[PDB]
Amino acid sequence: AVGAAMRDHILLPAQEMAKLGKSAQPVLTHAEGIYVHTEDGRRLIDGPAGMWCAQVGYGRREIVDAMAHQAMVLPYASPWYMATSPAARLAEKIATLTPGDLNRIFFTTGGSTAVDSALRFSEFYNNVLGRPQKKRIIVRYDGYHGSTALTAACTGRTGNWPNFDIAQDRISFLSSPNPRHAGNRSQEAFLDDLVQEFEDRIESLGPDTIAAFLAEPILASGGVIIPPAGYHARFKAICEKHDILYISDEVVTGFGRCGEWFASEKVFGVVPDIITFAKGVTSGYVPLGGLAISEAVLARISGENAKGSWFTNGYTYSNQPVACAAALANIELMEREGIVDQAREMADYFAAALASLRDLPGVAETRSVGLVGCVQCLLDGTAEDKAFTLKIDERCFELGLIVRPLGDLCVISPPLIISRAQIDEMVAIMRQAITEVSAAHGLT
Amino acid sequence: AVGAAMRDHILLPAQEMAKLGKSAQPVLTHAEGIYVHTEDGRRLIDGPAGMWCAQVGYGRREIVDAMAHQAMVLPYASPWYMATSPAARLAEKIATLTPGDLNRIFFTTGGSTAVDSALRFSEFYNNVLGRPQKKRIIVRYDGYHGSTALTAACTGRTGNWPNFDIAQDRISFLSSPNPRHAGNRSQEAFLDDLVQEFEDRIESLGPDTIAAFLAEPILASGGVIIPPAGYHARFKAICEKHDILYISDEVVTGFGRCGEWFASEKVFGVVPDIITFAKGVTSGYVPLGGLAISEAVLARISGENAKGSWFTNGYTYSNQPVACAAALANIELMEREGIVDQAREMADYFAAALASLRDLPGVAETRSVGLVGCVQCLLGTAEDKAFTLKIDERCFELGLIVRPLGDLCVISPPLIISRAQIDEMVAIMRQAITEVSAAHGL
Ligand SMILES: Cc1ncc(COP(=O)(O)O)c(C=O)c1O
Numbered sequence: 003a004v005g006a007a008m009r010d011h012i013l014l015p016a017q018e019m020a021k022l023g024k025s026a027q028p029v030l031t032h033a034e035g036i037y038v039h040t041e042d043g044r045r046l047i048d049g050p051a052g053m054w055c056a057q058v059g060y061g062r063r064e065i066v067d068a069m070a071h072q073a074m075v076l077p078y079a080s081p082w083y084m085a086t087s088p089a090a091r092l093a094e095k096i097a098t099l100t101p102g103d104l105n106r107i108f109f110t111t112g113g114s115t116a117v118d119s120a121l122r123f124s125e126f127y128n129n130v131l132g133r134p135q136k137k138r139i140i141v142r143y144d145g146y147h148g149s150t151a152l153t154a155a156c157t158g159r160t161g162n163w164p165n166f167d168i169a170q171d172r173i174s175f176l177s178s179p180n181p182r183h184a185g186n187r188s189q190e191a192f193l194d195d196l197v198q199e200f201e202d203r204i205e206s207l208g209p210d211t212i213a214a215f216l217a218e219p220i221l222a223s224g225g226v227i228i229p230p231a232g233y234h235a236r237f238k239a240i241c242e243k244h245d246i247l248y249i250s251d252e253v254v255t256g257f258g259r260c261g262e263w264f265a266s267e268k269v270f271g272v273v274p275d276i277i278t279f280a281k282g283v284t285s286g287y288v289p290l291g292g293l294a295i296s297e298a299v300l301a302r303i304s305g306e307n308a309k310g311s312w313f314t315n316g317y318t319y320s321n322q323p324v325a326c327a328a329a330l331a332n333i334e335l336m337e338r339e340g341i342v343d344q345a346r347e348m349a350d351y352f353a354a355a356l357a358s359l360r361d362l363p364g365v366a367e368t369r370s371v372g373l374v375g376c377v378q379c380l381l382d383g384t385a386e387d388k389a390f391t392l393k394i395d396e397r398c399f400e401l402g403l404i405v406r407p408l409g410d411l412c413v414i415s416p417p418l419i420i421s422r423a424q425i426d427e428m429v430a431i432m433r434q435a436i437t438e439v440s441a442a443h444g445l446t
Numbered sequence: 447a448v449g450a451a452m453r454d455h456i457l458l459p460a461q462e463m464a465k466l467g468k469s470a471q472p473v474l475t476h477a478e479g480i481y482v483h484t485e486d487g488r489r490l491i492d493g494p495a496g497m498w499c500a501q502v503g504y505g506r507r508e509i510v511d512a513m514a515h516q517a518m519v520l521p522y523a524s525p526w527y528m529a530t531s532p533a534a535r536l537a538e539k540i541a542t543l544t545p546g547d548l549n550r551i552f553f554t555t556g557g558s559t560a561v562d563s564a565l566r567f568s569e570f571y572n573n574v575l576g577r578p579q580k581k582r583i584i585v586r587y588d589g590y591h592g593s594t595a596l597t598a599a600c601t602g603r604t605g606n607w608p609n610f611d612i613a614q615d616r617i618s619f620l621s622s623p624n625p626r627h628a629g630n631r632s633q634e635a636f637l638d639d640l641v642q643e644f645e646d647r648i649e650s651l652g653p654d655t656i657a658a659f660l661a662e663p664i665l666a667s668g669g670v671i672i673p674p675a676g677y678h679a680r681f682k683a684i685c686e687k688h689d690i691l692y693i694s695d696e697v698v699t700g701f702g703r704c705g706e707w708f709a710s711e712k713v714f715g716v717v718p719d720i721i722t723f724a725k726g727v728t729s730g731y732v733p734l735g736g737l738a739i740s741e742a743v744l745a746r747i748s749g750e751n752a753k754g755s756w757f758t759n760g761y762t763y764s765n766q767p768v769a770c771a772a773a774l775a776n777i778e779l780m781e782r783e784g785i786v787d788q789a790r791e792m793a794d795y796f797a798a799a800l801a802s803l804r805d806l807p808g809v810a811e812t813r814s815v816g817l818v819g820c821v822q823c824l825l826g827t828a829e830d831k832a833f834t835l836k837i838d839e840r841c842f843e844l845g846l847i848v849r850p851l852g853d854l855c856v857i858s859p860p861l862i863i864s865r866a867q868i869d870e871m872v873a874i875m876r877q878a879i880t881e882v883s884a885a886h887g888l
């Protein structure tokens with residue numbers, strides 16, 4: 003009956019239009035800890051933490067109570083005219099966690115709107131500065147920045163492109179900083195070529211035309227792609243030379259995922275100009291997004307430098323008290339129980355548990371940073387491998403584990419509170435699923 | 447200290463950059479019924495119902511208990527892979543309330559992303575049909591459709607435009623359908639000119655280049671601008687002639703605001719191809735938006751006609767169980783207490799109460815539809831814009847929030863507002879207009 007309602011009345015994200023009104027999705031009913039349950043009652047490990055969001059897991063009354071209390075007391079105030087305590091205190095809190103002087107926050111309802119607003123900010127910025135040509139955005143193939151028209155245009159995941167008008171002169175794609183595209187080169191020489199590609203792009207487009215460089219610290223939806231060490235710092239140095247805003251998209255990496263509140267500086271060696279965030283900010287309990295903007299950047303277009311300008315960008319649910327109260331409870335809980343510390347302390351055990359799968363003939367590679375990980379499966383990335391990995395994903399589900407299928411990769415990013423025992427349980431399910439499917443494909 | 451934290455750590459929507467770090471907003475602390483209260487302890491009527499969203503007003507535990515329950519049980523499920531009861535039941539519920547066959551729903555987190563997705567669909571739709579040139583969007587001056595880069599560019603409120611790269615070749619602006627722009631013409635003849643301008647625009651651009659016509663039924667943020675009667679049906683007929691998708695933006699008008707679940711057909715006489723909604727679907731308790739798409743539209747690009755296409759648009763919080771449970775509880779509460787019927791029955795009284803202000807020398811005009819209305823104040827000019835801001839400020843001091851909008855004071859109260867509370871609201875307005883007028887010498 004729930005399935006019949008989904009089928010007849012919902013348009014799904016990434017819906018195969020040939021199977022519109024015939025599609026089946028598993029029905030989830032309830033959840034606790036790292037676990038979710040089907041309408042059959044069967045318990046499964048939420049390997050992706052929903053969608054890299056459920057940092058503290060499911061069933062935390064602390065977030066729910068703070069949500070409910072604020073919803074009753076004062077659920078809405080217009081952010082154009084009226085201030086609230088939740089928004090004020092949340093912005094104050096996040097300002098203590100960000101690198102450098104990124105101490106002023108603009109709030110949105112999710113990651114796309116935050117990145118959209120970061121990009122609209124880069125426009126505004128250069129317009130106020132009297133640089134109307136300085137508008138272009140530099141991104142990478144395999145990157146993901148959202149699903150608004152502009153943010154999808156900034157998205158390097160080309161599987162999302164068909165039947166959308168993605169290409170435009172404002173946006174230029176650099177190569178994916180994938181270590182396994184290094185070929186006959188060392189990782190250090192591959193990084194040399196990556197960096198040179200960027201400065202060549204700057205030269206051919208003209209620095210005076212480029213507003214922003216937009217980059218996830220690791221390319222999560224691309225398949226947990228970790229740039230060769232030093233990438234972020236080398237690119238930042240180049241941005242600063244040409245006065246190009248570095249927007250680090252920490253929608254996935256932020257709020258504990260890479261063992262830190264923000265991965266940009268502490269893990270990846272970059273102090274960005276802007277950080278975007280979502281997901282983990284509320285542990286996926288309610289929609290919130292936003293962007294932290296550098297004080298020195300804002301000073302150049304405000305005060306005596308304002309030129310009578312007004313930042314006429316904003317959403318109805320920007321600074322919404324309910325979502326901000328929930329996030330505040332989330333962060334306070336994560337602080338209280340050292341959950342960010344927990345993720346940092348579990349990272350090596352996580353990496354090593356995944357690495358024990360490299361034993362298998364079906365496994366090409368495993369990688370990870372913090373508690374985001376990846377198992378690459380090849381028949382030995384062709385079309386045969388994608389279907390093979392899909393069958394592994396399916397077998398994992400049957401044995402009690404949700405993995406996220408990304409082409410030839412099984413992706414896991416579990417709640418940050420996952421134990422050593424639960425990690426091994428997860429891995430043992432993956433091992434069984436890989437072994438059995440590989441046998442049906444003649445791997446020996 | 448709350449105001450110190452806003453000052454130093456928050457960038458506001460429409461922030462005056464000359465006053466960044468010095469802007470002070472009144473702090474709201476708590477709310478109940480139609481009222482909200484400031485930090486200083488003053489009680490205020492929420493005249494705009496927040497931002498045309500608080501349909502049932504504040505403190506309804508029905509919505510909050512349903513939020514809390516879902517948040518504990520299953521707060522998140524990935525919309526790409528996993529289904530949920532609240533999302534499914536809510537989509538089913540909305541489908542019973544929309545005009546025509548607008549029976550399939552795509553959820554987003556708000557109004558902008560609903561409209562952004564509607565427009566991305568129009569693009570997807572024509573690409574799947576083998577019509578890659580059929581992409582242009584027709585909108586109107588004074589219209590408002592959002593704050594994403596695409597939806598802002600579709601926004602005809604030119605006050606939002608400076609220092610943003612709004613202009614683009616895909617989007618063309620018609621004249622605002624504003625009755626006070628008729629001049630020497632009758633309202634009917636003015637309507638004839640609006641319709642003719644649209645037809646001429648289609649011919650000038652070429653019909654085969656136009657994907658969508660995007661329009662609020664009434665132009666809310668644009669200044670409670672109600673098109674001459676017949677506008678919507680006549681534009682729709684023209685849309686259908688050229689296979690242009692009529693996208694009716696009911697982000698403000700939807701869920702009771704015009705005395706109806708959806709204003710499009712039952713008030714303004716158009717069955718659209720797509721309806722976008724948000725705000726009042728949850729009574730403002732939690733972010734939710736979405737769009738309702740016509741079954742016939744979708745059939746042309748799905749099933750046998752799919753051409754191996756995949757609608758690869760979607761947000762992480764699409765179909766979010768908590769927002770959908772809140773919305774479902776909101777709608778069910780509105781059904782039980784007949785709140786849509788209440789708003790329909792209160793509209794004439796609301797209209798007449800505002801019209802009692804026309805008495806005043808300072809008041810030029812009042813207009814309304816359903817439970818959205820406005821009062822025009824003149825001494826027009828920027829002097830009148832500063833005059834109206836003063837009236838707004840005096841209203842606040844006397845216990846009423848109004849939305850300032852040029853020379854208009856705009857109200858859109860919770861739909862459960864009583865005759866008594868309407869009178870209270872108007873008495874505050876009357877006092878504030880008489881006081882500011884006398885101080886300006888009138
Ligand atoms: C890195 C990154 N940025 C932006 C987004 C878009 O966020 P949302 O889907 O909440 O709009 C995503 C998607 O989760 C993302 O992974």
Ligand SMILES: Cc1ncc(COP(=O)(O)O)c(C=O)c1O
Nearest residue numbers: 317318556557558591592697698
């Ligand atoms: C008619 C209309 N459409 C779209 C929007 C944008 O909605 P949101 O601010 O939730 O993104 C607005 C503002 O609420 C609106 O008034």
